[PDB]
RNA sequence: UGCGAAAGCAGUUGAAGACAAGUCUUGUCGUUCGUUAAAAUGGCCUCG
């Protein structure tokens, strides 16, 4: 998908509607931003934890 | 009678149990006889683990009083339920409930108890061979019990539907007492 | 002085400040301090040496009745 | 280094204003961190101290580009978060709450730069595609 | 046994008052009728079990406010199967809100049981890389959003 | 100038971007924007990891007895 | 099956009938039920109390 | 895990109680014949009464209560009563005893000996070497 | 507890009286004034 928007984004651009015929990849696209506020609030209870014994 | 806590009366009318503060004892008289009247402290009745445990082991939820007057129930907010025999004051427990007993009602003829509470389950205790029968998922926790009937037809429940903050809902609900089905809501 | 559960240690030429489950016993039987209960229960306790002190402690499956937590 | 850590531990006795230049001596490293909370932070005031004066620091700029004083935070949390939140100072409380307020924006302004990055990136490779 | 077949077509009262029984539970719905939280959990994290189906039970006990109930009577002989799963569906976009949950509470109910377990630490430092390849995904997604808008 | 809260002037930049487009972008101080936005993420990770932490026998044993 | 009638009172009325069935159907035909009624007061009894494990039929 | 009175005259059931969820391993009563202790593999010992004097008149005993002391089966139980004693023995494959009141088992306090008492040693320590 | 959006922004806990335990020190409250202000081994029927 990078490459795609990257070499045809002028293309892309020259479309009458873009969000009805790429609602699929935009939808998906945000499921996985979601992700990233709680994937760190577990990374940082697990570094603490990983930190602890290791260093013990 | 002064400082009167909790009371309860039989389900002929004839006997009224109370509990005063003169910590606290129970006193079981008759209403229109003078054949009944007896008086006794709680800590007789409440035991020594329990003396040693919070006050939820020692705080009585629910009372109530055979016909004949030899039974009485106590329920205590650690959901214990314990018969006493008041002859001779000794101590039987019953113990289902997880949290407060919220009612207690004996048979006519006083061989079975009905309890409910907050599990929205009631309980007959066959205390005969101290089994127990169920009804689960009703609608609400259960207030106050009854048996209604020269021979025990229905069961008279009140239900309250603790999950609205904003008022206290009241439903009546008369069971038919041989399958156990809503004969009236 | 030493038993089951409890390790002590009495000087004798010093004096001390004067200051329910078994026989009641009313029949007959027939016809410079230290005190600890940290070590339990104990199988043997003996000095090594003048300043060592040895103390000797003990270190199935069963019914499932668990215990409801909330 | 030793004589960072005894000059830091003398000023932590003393209630020096100088404390936080202390902990942004560029002498610092980051295993050296460690030993020092380890070793040396064996009262809770000084801990208390410490903490205060970083959380101060960091409240007043978050975006400061020196890493040190957040890698001194990050360890401190990591290895005495028991005492920390043992302290029942009120004001440590309140610092703490003005300390997780300044971070608690960065992290809402996160999402955003990502996406700015990830245009710039496409624009970047455009141009390089276009040249060549 | 001769009338077996008649179904009362000549009466005049016709009476039906059987029920069907309800169809087949499974174990794991038993156990949570009977509420058996921590064998509920064992029934999750076991062989031929349904990925979507392990999601329910595990969001179950969660809606009935039973995960740190279900986490306490264990061990690291016991704990692996849960933390074998959670290095899976932690790459699950659908799992993944849910493996943090549960995750968050085994570490704060199990640091101490953890130093003195060497497997258990390893387990934990592999959920670490993927949990840490999964924020990268979750950066890039971002990226890529970021450019589909200018797009557009 | 931004080279040289701050989110709401991110996404007004951010705004900007996809306003000026691609074309008109050029490379020279696309390369300073792309080097001060990187800055910006390290420093914004680095705080949100500090923002969830501030959130978050033997056989033998020889000791001294005190008498 | 059979007819029941209470002793005391001696308007009501009753039928009992079992089988091989691990319940028991009460029929109440007091008042008009037994003939004027449009349906059938029918309850069943399907309940021990406890002893189901003595009790597997109750045809007898 | 059921406890059964019997008729001796006619040998015929009185009264079941279903107590236990185990085997029931043994039976002790009190001098009177007012409590019954059963005890097994359950870990639980349960108390039936028939001290009211309506249950000596009916012939009915009680299931009153039943205390958790064990970590595992009770293989032994024995009663003791005398006007200085009153003592409710158990022990099994815990390895040690826990003593209880038999008037006042409901409520009475209990005692768990130790599972090794060393009035007879066995263990010798060497100074010498 | 107040406002507010879900984010948050401000602030809050006191005086008694009675009793239990130790032996003068502590707890509790089926008791009052004021302030916007865990744990009695104890889990939910039958109708195949």
Redesign the interface.
């Known amino acids: 998908?990078?490459w795609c928007?990257?070499?045809h984004?002028?293309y892309?651009?020259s479309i009458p509607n873009?969000?009805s015929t790429?609602s699929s990849?935009?939808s998906t696209?945000?499921?996985?931003?979601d992700?990233?506020?709680?994937?760190?609030?577990?990374?940082?209870?697990?570094?603490?934890?990983?930190?602890?014994?290791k260093?013990? | 009678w002064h400082n009167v806590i909790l009371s309860n009366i039989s389900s002929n009318g004839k006997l009224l149990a109370h509990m005063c503060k003169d910590h606290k004892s129970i006193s079981v008289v008759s209403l229109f006889d003078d054949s009944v009247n007896l008086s006794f402290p709680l800590g007789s009745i409440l035991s020594s683990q329990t003396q040693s445990l919070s006050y939820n082991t020692r705080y009585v939820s629910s009372m109530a009083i055979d016909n004949m007057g030899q039974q009485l129930a106590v329920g205590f907010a650690s959901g214990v339920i314990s018969i006493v025999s008041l002859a001779d004051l000794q101590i039987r427990l019953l113990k289902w409930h997880i949290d407060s007993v919220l009612s207690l009602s004996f048979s006519h003829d006083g061989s079975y108890l009905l309890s409910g509470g907050w599990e929205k389950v009631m309980s007959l205790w066959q205390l005969e061979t101290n089994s127990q029968q169920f009804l689960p998922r009703l609608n609400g926790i259960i207030i106050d019990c009854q048996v209604l009937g020269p021979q025990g037809n229905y069961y008279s429940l009140i239900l309250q539907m603790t999950e609205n903050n904003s008022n206290s809902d009241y439903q009546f609900l008369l069971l038919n007492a041989s399958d156990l089905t809503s004969k009236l809501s | 002085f030493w038993g089951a559960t409890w390790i002590s240690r009495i000087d004798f030429d010093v004096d001390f400040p004067i200051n329910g489950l078994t026989i009641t016993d009313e029949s007959n039987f027939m016809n410079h301090f230290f005190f600890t209960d940290k070590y339990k229960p104990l199988l043997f306790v003996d000095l090594i040496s003048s300043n060592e002190l040895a103390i000797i402690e003990r270190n199935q499956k069963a019914f499932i009745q668990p215990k409801l937590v909330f | 280094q030793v004589e960072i850590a005894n000059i830091l531990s003398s000023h932590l006795e003393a209630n020096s204003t100088e404390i936080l230049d202390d902990l942004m001596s560029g002498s610092w490293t980051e295993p050296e961190i460690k030993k020092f909370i380890l070793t040396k932070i064996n009262t809770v005031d000084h801990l208390s101290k410490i903490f205060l004066t970083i959380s101060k620091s960091i409240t007043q700029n978050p975006w400061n580009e020196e890493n040190l004083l957040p890698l001194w935070l990050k360890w401190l949390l990591t290895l005495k978060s028991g005492e920390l939140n043992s302290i029942k100072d009120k004001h440590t409380k309140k610092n703490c709450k003005h300390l997780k307020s300044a971070l608690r924006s960065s992290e809402e302004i996160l999402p955003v730069l990502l996406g700015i990055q990830g245009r710039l990136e496409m624009l970047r490779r455009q141009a390089k595609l276009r040249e060549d | 046994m001769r009338g077996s077949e008649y179904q009362g077509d000549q009466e005049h009262i016709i009476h039906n008052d059987k029920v069907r029984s309800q169809r087949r539970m499974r174990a794991f719905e038993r156990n949570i009728n009977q509420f058996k939280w921590s064998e509920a959990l064992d029934n999750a994290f076991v062989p031929g079990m349904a990925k979507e189906l392990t999601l329910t039970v595990l969001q179950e006990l969660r809606k009935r406010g039973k995960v740190r109930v279900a986490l306490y009577g264990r061990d690291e002989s016991t704990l692996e199967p849960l933390l074998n799963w959670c290095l899976k569906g932690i790459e699950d976009v659908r799992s993944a809100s849910i493996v943090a949950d549960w995750v968050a509470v085994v570490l704060e109910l199990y640091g101490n049981t953890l130093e003195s377990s060497p497997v258990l630490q390893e387990l934990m430092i592999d959920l670490k890389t993927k949990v840490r390849h999964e924020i990268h995904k979750s950066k890039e997604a971002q990226r890529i959003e970021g450019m589909l808008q200018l797009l557009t | 100038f931004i080279t040289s809260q701050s989110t709401q002037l991110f996404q007004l930049l951010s705004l900007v971007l996809d306003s000026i487009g691609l074309f008109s972008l050029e490379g020279a101080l696309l390369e300073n924007l792309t080097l001060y936005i990187d800055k910006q993420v390290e420093i914004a990770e680095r705080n949100t990891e500090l923002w969830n932490l501030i959130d978050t026998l033997p056989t033998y044993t020889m000791e001294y007895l005190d008498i | 099956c059979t007819f029941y009638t209470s002793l005391s009172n001696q308007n009501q009325q009753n039928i009992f009938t079992a089988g091989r069935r691990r319940y028991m159907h009460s029929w109440d035909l007091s008042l008009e039920n037994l003939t004027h009624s449009q349906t059938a007061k029918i309850e069943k009894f399907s309940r021990l109390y406890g002893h189901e494990s003595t009790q597997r039929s109750f045809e007898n | 895990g059921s406890i059964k009175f019997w008729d001796f005259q006619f040998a015929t059931l009185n009264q079941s109680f279903k107590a236990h969820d185990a085997d029931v391993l043994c039976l002790t009563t009190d001098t009177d014949n007012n409590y019954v202790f059963s005890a097994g593999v359950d870990r639980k010992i349960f108390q039936f009464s028939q001290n009211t004097n309506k249950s000596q008149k009916n012939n009915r005993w009680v299931n009153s209560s039943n205390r958790l002391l064990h970590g595992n089966d009770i293989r032994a139980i024995c009663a003791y009563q005398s006007k200085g004693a009153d003592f409710l023995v158990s022990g099994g494959v815990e390895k040690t005893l826990v003593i209880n009141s038999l008037t006042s088992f409901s409520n009475g306090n209990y005692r768990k000996m130790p599972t090794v008492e060393p009035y007879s040693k066995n263990v010798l320590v060497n100074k010498e070497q």
């Open positions: 998908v990078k928007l990257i070499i984004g002028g892309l651009v873009l969000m790429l990849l935009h696209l945000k499921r996985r931003s992700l990233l506020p709680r994937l760190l609030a577990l990374d940082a209870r697990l570094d603490c934890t990983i930190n602890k014994f260093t013990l």
